[PDB]
Amino acid sequence: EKSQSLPFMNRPALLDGSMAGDVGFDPLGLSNIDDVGIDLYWLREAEVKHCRVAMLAVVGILQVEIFGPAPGCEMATDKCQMDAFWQLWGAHPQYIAFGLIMIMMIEMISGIATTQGRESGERAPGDFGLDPLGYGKGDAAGFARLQAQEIANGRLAMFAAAGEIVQGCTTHQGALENLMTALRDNSF
């Protein structure tokens, strides 16, 4: 009857309790929309993709700052987020637009699958069937934990990824550089 996360208000009607991470947090009623080609199925497919991109982006920033670039790249610089990106583009832009076309082929097909996956309810939101390791032929209670840990880490990574981009473009220093700077100023 009442939202677990907003206990002063009613729980939204379509937030059944079945998806991982569902604590009934939707105060504005966005799960209710069924117009302009988007709904709870499209919003969940959006969220899981935002999760995944942001989880990779945090490790990708921390990788080439702690350990530097991959072998075959040079002229390392202050921040690894923007300063290296325009630098590599100017250095050798072939591998970076190789990927942009390869992502483009993957996205056009995953977008067809999302529209085909809602018309016939046999594609789980987020599910591309990628389980080469077999986590999921195991315990259903243990696999339901893996579903919630993907969402919980992915939600936290969205703030961290959007964090490291914006304070990279603001301070023009590295992300671990910004953490040690903030440690110095609020030394307390």
């Binding site: 907003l6 002063f8 208000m9 105060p27 504005l28 009623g29 100023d185 609020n186």
Partner: protein, 214 residues
């Protein structure tokens, strides 16, 4: 003038208000709400407009909030902000003995000598702009309820959130809850006028910026 006047559907010509005994009582006032003495000399509770229209427009669907309910919800929020703002304005000025300031040079005495220049100084820096976004998130996550109550789908009291982390009132008699609620209102009312005092004097031609602002 020959229609039925609007003074009759919102003025109740039988009883009189406790405050101002020469005016009749507004129709939506009762003794029900805490901190009530029937005080409404301008008959604001009686305006038959839906003030939830500001959040969501009236053309979205059939819906109506009581005017009295939206006022109480405002007055509680005006109370809460002013209780903290008056307290936070003096505490950073050193009116309670210790000049309470955040760690770090940017919020120290040398960059900001008193709270009067903290709004313009922090606005340029950005710490002011950050708090605007942080409040924005809360307001949006807490102002959607007004819609629910206006659709008749909720039985929540005005300004009531399940925020009692220390369990002040769990299991208290309605007499005990009402008295406590009156304290939120009476202390809130005094602090709305306290902040209006402090912010006004401190901005005229004279007037210092010490703990006493006269």
């Amino acid at each position: 003038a020959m229609p039925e006047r609007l003074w009759d559907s919102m003025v109740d010509k039988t009883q009189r208000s406790k405050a101002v005994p020469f005016l009749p009582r507004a129709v939506n006032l009762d003794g029900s709400l805490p901190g009530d003495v029937g005080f409404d000399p301008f008959y604001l509770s009686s305006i038959p407009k839906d003030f939830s229209g500001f959040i969501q427009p009236p053309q979205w669907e059939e819906k109506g909030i009581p005017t009295l309910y939206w006022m109480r919800e405002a007055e509680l929020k005006h109370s809460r902000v002013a209780m903290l703002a008056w307290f936070g304005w003096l505490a950073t000025d050193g009116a309670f003995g210790v000049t309470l300031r955040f760690p770090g040079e940017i919020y120290s005495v040398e960059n900001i000598p008193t709270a009067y220049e903290a709004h313009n100084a922090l606005v340029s820096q950005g710490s002011m702009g950050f708090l605007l976004l942080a409040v924005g998130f809360i307001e949006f996550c807490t102002g959607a309820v007004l819609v629910e109550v206006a659709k008749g789908d909720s039985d929540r009291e005005a300004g009531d959130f399940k925020l009692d982390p220390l369990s002040f009132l769990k299991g208290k008699s309605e007499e005990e809850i009402k008295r406590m609620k009156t304290r939120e209102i009476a202390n809130g009312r005094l602090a709305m006028l306290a902040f209006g005092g402090v912010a006004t004097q401190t901005a005229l031609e004279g007037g210092n910026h010490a703990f006493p602002y006269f």
